[PDB]
Design a protein around this ligand. Structure first.
Ligand SMILES: COC(=O)COc1cccc(CN)c1
Ligand code: NA
Length: 330
């Protein structure tokens, strides 16, 4: 089997991407944020505290003939941005792009934090990291990918995120029309539950490439590129008037600037992030200070190759017995 679904930016900045997902029988279509940095499939639901729902589409298990309460199971998750949700669990049929999983754990939110409520465009998350991170207790649950894997033509999914445009998530096959050149594969550590890999270095604009190991995670559910402070300082030093602002919470730059590209290494291969991809626009409406798309990881504990990096590439998440991660230019 295979599946193929279009993923669409939620706003003009590519803050996140939503992909339609069919849940239940008859289908209830919810727009979920596919997140390679987490492992829960959770949804706004008929159980979500009414004051915490503002425009989201909800999953109503009582209207699904295939929904079953997963008796006693609960979930609770916190994300890198301080957002959180929790609730109880149903099993149901879930389809993505024509690929169906029966008996998928669908985590129904009873509570969500303010950042979720305030984002009317995101109806929940579909986690695609390793199932070892899944928060369901007392019986940990599998991700949609882990449940689909054995049925797929090839145990892979691919992320092809657009810059200010729709893109694609494919399951079970690698679309050789979707990238240029070759795919470079690199090793993955599953030790922390993530698609964790080591970049071979970076360059700023037309500068020389610096060979250096940077260990980080491929995370479709993080907007920006978070890298070590040394790397980030070297990037922003090439932008007149850029500075780190403690008041704003990261590097800002004059909106009049033209940003340099940023290159990261994948083995001997190179992925170039155009400068435009790094511009996240005014810090507040009408401001002439703009927010940068490359930020320091020093306050995280992990480097994160989020959407700013991933959307410059065709990315293969290879879930074979020994997982790997492939990158191609496009
Ligand atoms: C999509 O919202 C964001 O990107 C918020 O900033 C983050 C920064 C670091 C990690 C995370 C966890 N995904 C989020
Ligand atoms: Na922000």
């Amino acid at each position: 089997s295979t599946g193929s679904a279009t993923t669409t930016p939620i706003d003009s900045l590519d803050d996140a991407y939503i992909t339609p997902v069919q849940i239940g029988t008859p289908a209830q279509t919810l727009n979920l944020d596919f997140d390679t940095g987490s492992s829960d499939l959770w949804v706004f639901s008929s159980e979500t505290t009414a004051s915490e729902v503002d425009g989201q589409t909800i999953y109503t298990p009582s209207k699904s003939t295939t929904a079953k309460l997963l008796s006693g199971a609960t979930w609770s998750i916190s994300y890198g941005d301080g957002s959180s949700s929790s609730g109880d669990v149903y099993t149901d049929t879930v389809s993505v792009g024509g690929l169906t999983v029966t008996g998928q754990a669908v985590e129904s939110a009873k509570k969500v934090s303010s950042s979720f409520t305030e984002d009317s465009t995101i109806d929940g998350l579909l986690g695609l990291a390793f199932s070892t991170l899944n928060t369901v207790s007392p019986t940990q649950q599998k991700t949609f990918f882990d449940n689909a894997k054995a049925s797929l033509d090839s145990p892979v999914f691919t992320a092809d995120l657009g810059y200010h445009a729709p893109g694609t998530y494919n399951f079970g096959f690698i679309d050789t029309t979707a990238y240029t050149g070759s795919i470079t594969y690199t090793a993955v550590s599953t030790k922390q539950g993530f698609w964790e890999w080591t970049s071979t270095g970076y360059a700023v604009g037309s500068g020389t490439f610096k060979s250096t190991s940077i260990d980080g995670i491929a995370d479709t559910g993080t907007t920006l590129l978070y890298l070590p402070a040394t790397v980030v300082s070297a990037y922003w030093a090439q932008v007149s008037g850029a500075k780190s602002s403690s008041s704003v919470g990261g590097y800002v730059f004059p909106c009049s600037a033209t940003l340099p590209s940023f290159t990261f290494g994948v083995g001997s291969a190179r992925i170039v992030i155009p400068g435009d991809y790094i511009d996240f626009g005014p810090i507040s409406t009408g401001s002439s200070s703009c927010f940068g798309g490359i930020q320091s990881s020093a306050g995280i504990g992990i480097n994160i190759f989020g959407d700013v990096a991933l959307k410059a590439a065709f990315v293969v998440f290879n879930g074979a017995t020994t997982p790997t991660l492939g990158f191609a230019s496009k």
